[PDB]
């Protein structure tokens, strides 16, 4: 067999990677952070409650102004919230109600949404006609859209359930770069602060560092054991966290190319649905299937806080660009600021 | 002064909540349905490229919204969680190379025992009983070789067959129903109930069956709000 003689080099390269990563594994993140001061109990209280949505809220994204946030709910509504005054700025009716992701552009002028329709709908929030209308529909994806993030006003990276991530040009409406590395449904992507590389977590228990401009997969992180449903870059741009169904969060590194930390607990046997760092990356706020969030210590790996004010599964959470608020969307149609 | 832009914002929220209130009426009145087949189960004929096919139909002034996942891959473990808030999952079974019936039994097993589908009832539609009608009465054993417990199985005496229907198909027709019920009577827990039917992709009451079955789901959901059942 020739294909079996082709996997001879693949497993030899895998064992070479498993041995190359062993040389860099001279210590552990707990070994370097064993003497640091623990952050103690991080207790956050619900400051706002966005109860405008009807169905379960699947996704949410903060604006770079740290005040306006957009949320996606399975009822077909993309509501832009003024987190300071709880006043709904917009109520975008979606063509397809089964939206699984929404992205707030850094410019604040555009917003996105995607889901089972396999189409990313870019809505212009600055319209002189009087209504928020579809600016461009991206129907190139062959699977459901699980995550999408804005690079520019005309660039947006949308991951999809077809094991493929894609880079889009909103003007032409065509894929400029297609990432076909993952073997499972890509559930979440996360852009780096430089917006030149992004990591995508898929159902293959592996996370891949994708170069946006070159279109190649730089590194692959398969430290997890189940479907990676969540991913979030570290604020420095060199690391990222991954939430999977194995009830474990794992902090990888783009330079060590291996798992640096594992956030696990015997009380937690439920999959993670969303992860997020703080402005300093010290706290790892992760959404769980326990109907509540957990404030993990990225350096100590010990749980430092719990956000238990959600009735149903916390499907999404997000931390502002200034680290002042933490919105946590859940399946109970309620967003809450922590 | 900035209070002139806040009063325009609080009055914009007034228009939004009025739209959300008017949209809350059409959302709760409309019953979302998931038409999920088992491959070549004939789910296309029950309705009579895109990521999902939204189908609209009303029965007795009650609007239903059936959703058929068209361009979705066979890996359903992720996008099936989006259908937690649906009234029912229309499970279409071929009922007749690969053992498609066992694949439907394993798909129904994963759907029934899914932690996010514990409250979602399933309207089981054993479709294509016309094709099954000649697979049992003309030799060509496809239910006995694929299920050895079918030999030691008799038609229930209380079962009601169709007028002019041989017991050989009725035994196989109800054995397929009993195979899916062995999963329902195990993980029911008084939260969701399976509603098996014998559809043929040629009937005219399949939509009426969903209407009558969705009536029991909403009834049993309201019966549990008062802690009656």
């Amino acid at each position: 067999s020739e294909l079996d003689q082709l996997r001879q080099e693949a497993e030899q390269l895998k064992n070479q990677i498993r041995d190359a990563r062993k040389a860099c594994a001279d210590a552990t993140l707990s070994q370097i952070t064993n003497n640091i001061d623990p952050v103690g109990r991080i207790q956050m209280r619900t400051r706002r409650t966005l109860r405008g949505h009807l169905a379960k809220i699947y996704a949410m994204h903060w604006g770079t102004d740290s005040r306006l946030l957009v949320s996606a709910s399975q009822d077909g509504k993309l509501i832009i919230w003024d987190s300071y005054t709880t006043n709904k700025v917009h109520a975008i009716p979606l063509r397809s109600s089964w939206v699984m992701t929404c992205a707030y552009a850094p410019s604040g002028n555009y917003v996105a949404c995607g889901g089972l329709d396999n189409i990313c709908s870019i809505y212009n929030l600055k319209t002189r006609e009087g209504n928020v209308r579809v600016s461009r529909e991206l129907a190139g994806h062959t699977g459901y859209l699980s995550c999408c993030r804005f690079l520019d006003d005309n660039q947006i990276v949308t991951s999809s359930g077809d094991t493929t991530c894609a880079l889009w040009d909103i003007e032409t409406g065509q894929q400029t770069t297609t990432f076909t590395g993952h073997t499972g449904d890509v559930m979440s992507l996360s852009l780096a602060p430089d917006t030149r590389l992004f990591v995508s977590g898929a159902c293959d228990a592996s996370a891949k560092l994708w170069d946006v401009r070159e279109g190649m997969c730089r590194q692959t992180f398969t430290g997890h054991e189940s479907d990676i449903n969540a991913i979030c870059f570290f604020p420095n741009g060199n690391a990222f966290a991954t939430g999977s169904d194995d009830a474990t969060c794992r902090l990888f590194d783009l330079r060590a190319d291996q798992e640096l930390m594992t956030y696990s607990h015997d009380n937690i046997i439920c999959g993670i649905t969303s992860v997020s760092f703080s402005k300093s990356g010290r706290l790892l706020l992760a959404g769980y299937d326990d109907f509540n969030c957990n404030v993990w210590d990225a350096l100590k790996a010990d749980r430092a806080g719990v956000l238990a004010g959600h009735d149903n599964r916390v499907s999404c959470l997000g931390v502002t660009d200034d680290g002042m608020a933490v919105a946590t969307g859940s399946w109970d149609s309620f967003l809450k600021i922590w | 002064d900035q209070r002139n832009e806040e009063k325009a914002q609080r009055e914009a929220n007034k228009k939004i909540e009025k739209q959300l209130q008017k949209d809350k009426q059409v959302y709760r009145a409309t019953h979302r349905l998931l038409l999920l087949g088992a491959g070549e189960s004939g789910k296309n004929t029950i309705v009579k490229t895109s990521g999902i096919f939204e189908t609209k139909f009303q029965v007795d002034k009650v609007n239903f919204h059936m959703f058929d996942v068209g361009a979705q891959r066979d890996e359903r473990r992720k996008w099936i969680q989006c259908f937690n808030d649906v009234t029912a999952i229309i499970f279409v079974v071929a009922s007749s190379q690969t053992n498609r019936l066992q694949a439907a039994l394993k798909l129904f097993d994963s759907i029934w025992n899914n932690k996010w589908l514990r409250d979602t009832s399933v309207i089981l539609f054993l479709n294509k009983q016309d094709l099954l009608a000649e697979k049992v009465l003309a030799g060509k054993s496809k239910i006995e070789d694929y299920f050895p417990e079918f030999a030691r199985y008799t038609t229930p005496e209380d079962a009601t067959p169709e007028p002019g229907e041989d017991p050989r198909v009725t035994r196989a027709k109800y054995f397929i129903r009993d195979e899916f019920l062995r999963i329902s009577t195990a993980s029911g827990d008084g939260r969701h109930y399976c509603y098996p039917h014998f559809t043929c992709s040629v009937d005219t009451e399949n939509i009426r069956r969903v209407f009558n079955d969705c009536r029991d789901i909403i009834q049993r959901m309201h019966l549990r709000q008062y802690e009656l059942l």
Partner: nanobody
Amino acid sequence: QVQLQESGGGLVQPGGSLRLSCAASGFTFSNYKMNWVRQAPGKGLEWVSDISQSGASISYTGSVKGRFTISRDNAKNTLYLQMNSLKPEDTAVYYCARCPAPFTRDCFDVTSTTYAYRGQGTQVTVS
């Protein structure tokens, strides 16, 4: 990395026997339901047998209800498929497919064409 390297297999005379091992490495055993799926030449991926994370719950497909016997050793992180009375219908690449999520009663996509928690497969031929 979830590594499901299966052992055993080969050409066996009809009415024989075969033991299929599955070295389940890279993940925490005894937490995931272990399944067995095959792919006959010219057919799609079908489910053969599964087993719970504790070994109590055991299921087989109809054709191998009494002939095959699944087994797992949580200590050795291995999965066994004691196949007996092999027929010319059992010639297929048997795959050791793990359940995607742990501590669940639901096992999805074990028979999908593309699945990352499925072993490389053992070419079991019955001739």
